[PDB]
Design a protein around this ligand. Structure first.
Ligand SMILES: [Mn+2]
Ligand SMILES: [Mn+2]
Lengths: 189, 194
């Protein structure tokens, strides 16, 4: 009732915030990530390297969020930790996020999302592209919210399902507020 | 020579890492790692640290692979994933376990060695986030640096790239020698005014 109506509202706000961030990224000359470092790499190699890195970066951040929300409830067994992480980084989950954000086949969608995450993070380290790091953080947060909401509806933990859904929804609502306010401050510059 | 620097490097890595680890063991926060749970079927906190340490090692290793290989366009992408796999695989983590004498080298299983290394990494990182135990974060970084150095030295000697074998090995050896100075220096700082 309250959670399923909020979940629908969350998907709209996530789309709006992520679309707004990404629309300003496409104004940046650095946006074509595959054509950088041309004296040292190629388009195909950049795509594999960014996907290589994005894979591990997503994996680490997803692991951190699983711990963040599940360790509070001792009723939850360790199977759900690995279960949730697997559910969060699998290509089907990433492809759903691909579709929700209208980024553009099963396997390609996940690879593209991973390459985008990794490319954005690496760009923010090698250039000034703090907007690109903001997008990667918000994209992973939306990936975790999307995954965990689905996962805990299919695999409700003992007694605390609605409370941990509320924790994740409250957390993600605050992140969306933070990402929105960061975007306006960066764009009101 | 590079191999003279290598054998000296393994002496210094053992001493720095053992020196940091000895200070961590004096800290009451070390108890929370529950490394005893490596022998137990009741090993929830140990598995959770291992769960996270696995991912943290993967990301840091990925970052180090990109760091050294991307300046060499001679090196194809297959060596990026080849080096990462060689670095995080259970066999490499076991060799580090044995090099540091973390536990018994015999009545302590092969996969168990890699799991303990991963759990120790994860627990240290989580302790630094939750308890501001910066010495534990220093150790996690130093341990992964040694893991990468040890792995990269063996990998590129076994799989020499085109033209640049010696140059990339010099790159990694010089870097790790600088890290060892940094970790030694950071430790001396910490132990005189924590
Ligand atoms: Mn990958
Ligand atoms: Mn992939």
């Amino acid at each position: 009732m309250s959670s399923t109506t909020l979940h629908n509202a969350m998907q709209y706000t996530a789309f709006d915030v992520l679309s707004s961030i990404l629309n300003l990224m496409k104004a940046d000359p650095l946006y074509d990530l595959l054509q950088l470092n041309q004296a040292y790499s190629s388009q195909d190699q950049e795509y594999e390297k960014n996907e290589f890195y994005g894979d591990s970066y997503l994996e680490e951040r997803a692991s951190s969020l699983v711990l963040k929300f599940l360790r509070k409830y001792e009723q939850i067994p360790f199977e759900m930790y690995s279960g949730l992480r697997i559910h969060t980084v699998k290509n089907q989950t990433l492809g759903e996020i691909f579709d929700l954000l209208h980024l553009g086949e099963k396997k390609k969608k996940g690879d593209l999302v991973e390459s985008l995450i990794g490319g954005c993070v690496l760009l923010s380290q090698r250039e000034n592209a703090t907007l690109f790091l903001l997008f990667a953080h918000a994209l992973i947060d939306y990936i975790f919210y999307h995954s965990s909401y689905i996962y805990f509806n299919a695999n409700p933990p003992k007694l605390v399902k609605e409370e941990i859904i509320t924790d994740i929804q409250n957390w993600f609502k605050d992140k969306l507020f933070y990402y929105r306010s960061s975007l306006e401050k960066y764009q009101t510059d």
